[model samples]
Each structure stands twice: as structure tokens, then as C-alpha cells.
Target: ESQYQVGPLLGSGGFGSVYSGIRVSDNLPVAIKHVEKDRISDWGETRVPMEVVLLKKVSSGFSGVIRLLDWFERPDSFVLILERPEPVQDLFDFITERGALQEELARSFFWQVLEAVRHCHNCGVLHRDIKDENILIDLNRGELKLIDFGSGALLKDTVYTDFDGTRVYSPPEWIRYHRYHGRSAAVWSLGILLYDMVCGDIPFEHDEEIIRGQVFFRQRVSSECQHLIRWCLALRPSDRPTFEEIQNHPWMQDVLLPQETAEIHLH
Candidate 1:
């Protein structure tokens, strides 16, 4: 007997369509993602899709990463069952409805996301796509999870020549040189994500502007926050702070923890 029941479609995009679902035995909510067979990439000794392998690897250690509950393959597509937290909205929608977030709120979300990204790196996975749409916020819990590992790859020290992530979130090195190191590219996306959270829009719109690596602030943001963003978005990947540096930055030091934020929200 099938153990999962797929429900209504939640979203559809070029890569796949995600439907709300539930595990029949435990009634656990899940997101059912159906990707065309062509979209799947073989990985590891067992030879499963890269998304499945990466999700399983990262979720095993990090609660901030979406958990892969189960998966199966059909004639023309692959189905992935993923944890779907309730009372949640993607960061894209969250930001769209509320406009730019306050510095304190952005700080809380940013802290959690950094932890998740670090976990991905530690687990030997590079989440090449780290845009707003790929992050989910649990409104009720005041927590967030990084999702969509479709663009992920096994981490390596070598510079990559191919880019699959959103253009605006990509680093300048990839634009100018067509190559980038894993950690530096990830940090650049983090900078873009932070800017989008506080500014309500990305800083660059065109490839030329991205290569120029200039950030023009529209909203009034704290100097510390601006400084961190500038450091992350540096034109030369070598100039960007390492993940450890980012975590230790003065701005990051004062942000509230996920549990603390939830407690304050409940009041």
C-alpha cells in the first residue's frame, strides 16, 4: 500500500511542481515535489538524484534544513516527499506582503539561515541556490528552514564553471570569470539574501552591474548591517568573509536566537 497521499498543488515552477501531502501512517505533513526525469542528476554510490542525496545528508544533522521524508521514481518523473512545516510562507511571499523587515527581525532570520548554510557546507553540500524563494518561514514558531536542493552539488575546493542558481544571487566572479569557489559563492548569495530581506529588492539587476559589485541602498539600514553586506558582496571572492568570519561579525553577535524570537513573538 502507498504510505503517502498527495494533496493540492502548492506551487509550480520550471524545475517541478510541489503538492501538499501527508504520510498516511502518521498524518505528517509533507511537500510532494515531482521533477521530470531529465531534471534529476545521478549522485553517490547508490546513484540517486542529487537533490535527494544532498537533502538526506544535510537534514541528518541540521534542523534548519528541510527534511527529506521519502522518495520514489515513476516512469517519467521523480517524486520527493519533504517536511512541510505548518503556518509557514516562503521568504519571498513573507517579504512581499510585509515589505522590508525591521533590522531586529531580519537579524533573527539571518542568524538561523547562517546556521543552516554552515551546516550545508559542513555536510559537503553546496546549496548553489540561496534566494528568498528557497527559504521558508514558520510564522507560528518564528523559525526558518532552507529548502530546494535541486541546484546543489557535492562540495569541492575547485572552482566551478557552470552556474545553475538565480542570476542575481550569483557572485561577481562567476559573472566575469565564469568560475567560482564554493564557499565564496555561497557567501555572496548570503549577502544578496540579506540585502533583499532589509531592502525589499536585490541590489543588482543586470550582469554588468553584478560584475561592478556596487550596492546602492534604498532603505535606511544600520551601518553594521551595511558593512556586512558590503563585505560579502565584494567583487573579488577572496575579499568576502569566510563563514566563520560572518558568524562572528559584530552585527551577527547581537541577533536573537530562534527560540528567543519565538518567545518574544508569543507575548
Candidate 2:
């Protein structure tokens, strides 16, 4: 196993601390995730295995997702080398810094996020935990990078029942099943993200019971952007639109396509 000179701690979580480091051989700045030995216990060791397998399989198709540069096992812990995005600022930070996003800006962000999700779906992987925190932004590059694959799962021909996902962004059916809903759940998360971006808060923040009831009963979302959100958040997995359907939604089209010269607005 190789070790780089670890620098200041970047962040810490239940898993372990991530630190800034420079690869001695190539002098490349990277984020090294050091998993704590005790934290894994017996059950958590499977997280590392799942992450490795999922990342290796899905990394090529989703390059915009966080890159796994290298990894090594140790007697006490495991170390992973990751490509450090240009000092990530979570979606919350973006909202705080730049108030409500303009329609144009929101569209750009939405398109990029949907594209990333589409790539994951194409690779037969479902990021069970999709949320603002997991979607890392590179302010310098004006791009988004998906992160935190610990909760990601590879979908098979059969549905899975190991229900695990963030409640704030999780779809109703997923909450009901307590198992990840494969691609449909991912779509629901995307819908919630879209709603959050526009409203500056989750729709179900105050009333989980209400949202859960409506979401599971297949409530109709507003014809505006909320309609798109509703489609993705459909209580039944079959009711949700495919990624292609989402990509071609009117909101996506309006936001992604360049405006004609005649359509430019001026004060």
C-alpha cells in the first residue's frame, strides 16, 4: 500500500476523515478518504467492497462523477485516492451565495444533473442517495460532480429490498418499501431536486405525512415545473417517466436550448 503526505483535514463523517494530499510520485493533489477501523465493524466493511465494485463499473460512463484515482487496504483502515474537484461548494452554498437562481441558470444546472443521472441509469447503477450534498459543484469549471457512492447499488433484473436512502430526497414508494426503487427512485429524487432548486426548499419539508400521502396516491403536480417534478415522483414506479421523457420535458428544452437572437431580453 502507498501513502501520500496527508495534509489538513478536509471533512469528517461517520466513515472517517478525508484529507488533502499530494501524490509523491506525480505531485497531483487528491482527496484521500481514510476509513476508520472501528466504524466499519463487521457490517460496514461491505460498504468499501460495494463502493469499489460500483465505482469501477460505472466510472467510465460517468466521468463527471467523482473519479477514484487509487485505493489501498491497511491493517487498521482503508485509503482511497479521489480526484479533488475545485473546492466543492454544495447546492446549499450556491443558494446562500446567489439567492434564487434565474430561470436560465436553474435550467443549466438541471440539465447537467439530469445528464449525470442518465449516465448512471444507462450503466445499470442506481445512486440510492441522491441529494444536494452528494451533488458536488466545481465553481471554477461551472460543472457538477456526483459524489458519495457508499449508498449506490447496482440494479439487476429483479427489484431490491435493501431500502436505504436519504428521506429528505427519497420518493414515497421507496419510503414505503424501505428498499431502493432502482431507476424510478432516482427519478423521484431528481424531481425533488428540481423542486428544491426552484422553490429554495423541499416541498415536503414541513409535512412529511402529507407529502408521503400525496406522493404515494399519485397526486397531480402543477402544470408548471411542478408537473415534471410530479412525474418523476410518481408513487408507483411504472407511472414515472423514463430518463428520455425527462430530458425532453418542456422545462428542460426551454432551459437547455440557446435562445434565438430575437428572443433576447433587454432592459
Give per-candidate clash totals: 0, 2
| Residue 166 CA displacement from its true place in model 1, Å | 0.5
Candidate lDDT scores, in order, read: 0.87, 0.68
Residue-level lDDT tens digits of model 2 in 1-267: 355778899778753688888888887778898875555532323355566566665678455577888878777887778877655677767776665555566667777787877777677767777777677676656667777776777766566777555777776665665655577777878877776666665567533652463532123333556677778777777899888899898877765332221133110
Error of 1 at 81 (Å): 0.7
Q: Name the candidate that leads on TM-score.
A: 1
Summing lDDT over every window of 10 consecutive residues in candidate 2, give the lowest-scoring window.
Answer: 258-267
TM-score of 2: 0.82
Give the number of the best model, judged by lDDT: 1
- Candidate 1 per-residue lDDT over residues 1-267, each given as its tens digit: 278887899999865999998889999999999999776654553457788888878879468899988888788888888899886799999889888888888889988999999899899999999989999987778789998988888999997988788999999888888899999999999999999999998899899989898899999999999999999999888999998899899988877877777677422
Alpha-carbon runs more than 4 Å astray in model 2: 1-3, 37-48, 210-223, 254-267
lDDT comparing candidate 1 with the true structure: 0.87
